Design an enzyme around this catalytic site. Sequence first.
Site, PDB file in Angstrom:
ATOM      1  N   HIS A 108      -8.173  -5.368   0.671  1.00 42.21           N
ATOM      2  CA  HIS A 108      -6.903  -4.652   0.802  1.00 42.21           C
ATOM      3  C   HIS A 108      -6.168  -4.930   2.127  1.00 42.21           C
ATOM      4  O   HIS A 108      -6.687  -4.638   3.197  1.00 42.21           O
ATOM      5  CB  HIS A 108      -7.212  -3.159   0.680  1.00 42.21           C
ATOM      6  CG  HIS A 108      -6.012  -2.287   0.494  1.00 42.21           C
ATOM      7  ND1 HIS A 108      -5.266  -2.285  -0.664  1.00 42.21           N
ATOM      8  CD2 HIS A 108      -5.455  -1.354   1.302  1.00 42.21           C
ATOM      9  CE1 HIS A 108      -4.289  -1.402  -0.556  1.00 42.21           C
ATOM     10  NE2 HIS A 108      -4.380  -0.827   0.631  1.00 42.21           N
ATOM     11  N   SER A 155       0.851  -1.171   0.000  1.00 40.86           N
ATOM     12  CA  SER A 155       0.000   0.000   0.000  1.00 40.86           C
ATOM     13  C   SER A 155       0.905   1.245   0.000  1.00 40.86           C
ATOM     14  O   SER A 155       1.674   1.420  -0.939  1.00 40.86           O
ATOM     15  CB  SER A 155      -0.816  -0.328   1.236  1.00 40.86           C
ATOM     16  OG  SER A 155      -1.769   0.742   1.444  1.00 40.86           O
ATOM     17  N   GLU A 205      -9.567  -5.144  -4.089  1.00 41.96           N
ATOM     18  CA  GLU A 205      -8.795  -4.009  -3.541  1.00 41.96           C
ATOM     19  C   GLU A 205      -9.657  -2.936  -2.831  1.00 41.96           C
ATOM     20  O   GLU A 205      -9.280  -2.412  -1.784  1.00 41.96           O
ATOM     21  CB  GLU A 205      -7.924  -3.307  -4.604  1.00 41.96           C
ATOM     22  CG  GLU A 205      -6.731  -4.060  -5.099  1.00 41.96           C
ATOM     23  CD  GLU A 205      -5.630  -4.140  -4.077  1.00 41.96           C
ATOM     24  OE1 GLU A 205      -5.700  -3.362  -3.114  1.00 41.96           O
ATOM     25  OE2 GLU A 205      -4.711  -4.987  -4.229  1.00 41.96           O
TER      26      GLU A 205
END
Lengths: 533, 539
Positions: free
Chosen positions: B440, B203, B327
Amino acid sequence: EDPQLLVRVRGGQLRGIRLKAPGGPVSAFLGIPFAEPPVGSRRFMPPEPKRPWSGVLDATTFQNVCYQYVDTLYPGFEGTEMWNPNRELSEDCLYLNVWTPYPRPASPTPVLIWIYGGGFYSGAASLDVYDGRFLAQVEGAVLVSMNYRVGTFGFLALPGSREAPGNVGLLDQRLALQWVQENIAAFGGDPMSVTLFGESAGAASVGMHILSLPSRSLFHRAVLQSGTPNGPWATVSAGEARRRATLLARLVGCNDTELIACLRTRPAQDLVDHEWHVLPQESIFRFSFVPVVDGDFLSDTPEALINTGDFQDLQVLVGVVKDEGSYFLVYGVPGFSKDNESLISRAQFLAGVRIGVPQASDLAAEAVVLHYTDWLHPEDPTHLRDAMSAVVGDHNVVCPVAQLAGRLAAQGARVYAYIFEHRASTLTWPLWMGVPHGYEIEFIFGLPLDPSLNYTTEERIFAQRLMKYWTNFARTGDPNDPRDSKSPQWPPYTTAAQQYVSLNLKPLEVRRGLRAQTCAFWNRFLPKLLSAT
Amino acid sequence: EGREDPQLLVRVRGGQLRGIRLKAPGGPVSAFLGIPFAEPPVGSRRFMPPEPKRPWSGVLDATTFQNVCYQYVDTLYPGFEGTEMWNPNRELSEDCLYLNVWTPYPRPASPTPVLIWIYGGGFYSGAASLDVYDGRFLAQVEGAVLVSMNYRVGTFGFLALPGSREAPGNVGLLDQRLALQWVQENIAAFGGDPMSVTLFGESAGAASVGMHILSLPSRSLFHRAVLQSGTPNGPWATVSAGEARRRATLLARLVGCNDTELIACLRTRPAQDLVDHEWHVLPQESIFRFSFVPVVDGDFLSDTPEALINTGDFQDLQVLVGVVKDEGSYFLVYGVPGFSKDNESLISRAQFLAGVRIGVPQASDLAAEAVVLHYTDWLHPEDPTHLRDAMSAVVGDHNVVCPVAQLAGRLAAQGARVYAYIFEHRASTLTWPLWMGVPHGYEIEFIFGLPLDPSLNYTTEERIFAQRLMKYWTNFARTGDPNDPRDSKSPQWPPYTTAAQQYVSLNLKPLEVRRGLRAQTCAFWNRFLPKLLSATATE
Ligand SMILES: *[C@@H]1O[C@H](CO)[C@@H](O)[C@H](O)[C@H]1NC(C)=O
């Protein structure tokens, strides 16, 4: 003298001819006049009804084809030739043809009325693909087809002028429609059951009769094959018509009255010679002289009128072919030919897009390219070619059809939709063209039943299914066999479920969504993209 | 010393360390936790580039994790494990700059290739001391030497008045670079091989890995790189110098404040006042946008990431990149009306249009319509289930998948060797709802091998899976290739290429190879959307 071939209409007496259809005789009455010949000072004007005649008019032969352009692209090629006029050209061409069962039906029979297409610049009701004997014989239909003026003669308009009001082509049609109303009962026809059907520019024409009140009292159901009143090619603004009419008049040597006067002096070939030099851009699927939004015949754009019409007591059957676009690529797009396999470069593909969507802005054309590019195979020439075809078909036929179906169903109309997926065994075009624009017609009209035509046997069976849907549709506004289980059934297209059937050699299969994602792009996004240049 | 354990004492350039003998499922590891690598960036040093740690005296105890960098704490679901696992787990403090080292126990014979983890957290949170970043497993099972560093987040790490002396920006990245240098100087003392260093992060960490790739002075400090669910390019990882200046100024105002005098005042503000206000300087209501991030300074970053990847030479480079299946689902639940972790989040078309404006905050009205048009299923435009998932995809594609696709493309074309994956397994022990799919951040725990800890209640297939992942990761660190050289019976992982765009699926089943990373949809985001801008009034 066969009394089955003697008919009396409001204008006088007609003698038709007996014709052989594979399984029987049919009465045929060809070249019946329905207008005073639109010649001399009549040129460019609304048609007037044919004056009555003495004795017995001979109606056993096709009359002259309305004066029009003749294609020379592939000289003597069966594929382009079958569309070319097959009688003498003349401005005096306002005649219609009726086919009926022999003997004359005893009870009033549904009437099918066929309007040829041809880009609004060509076509004739005498082509073999429009031969009505089969539907008459097999389905006991009374079938009518007319000639209507094309090109400048039918569609040149100086909006507002008295002497070139526009839309006279469609007025020719409307007049033949009145004639059918007034005379068809005499051939056994039921003026109370009249279905219009037409293809391409003819489907657009039918569409316009739907969208024009005075036409609506003259028919009950409509079939639009591969064309619509809405969309990029079928109409022009009064401004753009005025512009082209002036341009053409400059091109051949010519206030309104004075200008139309001089055009009236020119020989027909001179107008046809310059007809095509007035398109704003290098286009394909874009025509010089077409129905104009005059605020008379058309009181507003087709889009305006389909968005706001009331269509409750209407039934419509609408459809497209698998490969609408292919045909047109050889007629203006570099890299495309019927002789090779038209594999193209990414470059030729972007080039081809500024032509297919000639009216696109730079950014809109980029959007088209990005949408149709296969990003796994962005440079593959088979994809690039097939995509080019779809861009052209989708933009001009498929998506306009999707929109028309959707708007009609939402406003009360009963709608059936199809996609025609069978490629003729007899087809004279290359394989990459798939099933091209115009090649469902021979099947609907029943040609395969003529044995000498060298069609396969499953094709003859298929032809009969179609004649059945079309004629059932004409009888009842529902293409489904009214007694006969297990089909499965052809469901009405609706905005909710968006169902339509494939027409091919296998049984009906129901699908949902007529390229729905892609048509959303054309019908919804694309227009916003430009209404913000 | 004398009575100590002889295998836990190490010297580094700063001085002496006493580490700790940790237990992993399969045996002991050496841990050296809370090693300082910079001077405390406190007081007059706030906002300034890290200065290297002055040497200390005696044996520094390195048996516990040090402080977490001053940061905002998320309180959307108070007590919920799905959010608490990411929350800080040691005291908050500006004295902050420490790294951790895990090595086999006893330490490696020959020099071992080194992995460096860089945590994510939107550039406003994160700590290397979280359980999911526990390197005890990769150390024990793969023999890896694992390092992770704290770096300044939020204002303290990214507030910038570009051009100024006292707040140049990007100092969080410089904390990271200073730790890479530290690994160069010192990792040999633990058995690390400074000539084999692989960065990996997730990330915002992934994006940081990205920015080291793009910043010359960092390039000599590592050899390979793994980017998981994040890229330096894309709409959230960087801001213009003007935008950074504007956000810095606004934030100053909100707390009561010539650049010099303005920064001086910022330096007198209690850290907490800055945290309590950082989030207000965003320009639009948005998700997946963060107040204080790397600025394009014309320094650490010579140009924009987009520009730099579009041109640079990457012959020397091997890179592994990828994404999780869903995601964007995680993000909807935080700030899109209609969404929750506690119901099925079925939404309406209205809520979808609203969500697109939030998920794509920079969008003109037209661009936003282009998105809704692309994502609507025109067969069922009103269907709550379809809309819910589309909203997820809009956010996921715009922020991770298409920037990642974009980056794989450009790197491959510029001579880098690239490996790509999509991670598709939903942890049996996930506290989020099924609608969220594989969200995510939830592959990290498999990559670090947490499922090997029997006490964590993972399935056996999940244990076998995690080891598989650990092999790919370490094999990649080792050789610039995830593939097992020995075991070549089991399917192979092809490189991603411009041409074939091949990637693998990571799940319980053996590798399956797929072509095209959301290729049609990424053409929209990466090619069309930019051009669709060509408007003046947003900002
Ligand atoms: C796992 O399982 C045990 C026994 O059923 C339970 O007591 C424990 O609290 C659970 N631990 C976790 C981390 O789920």
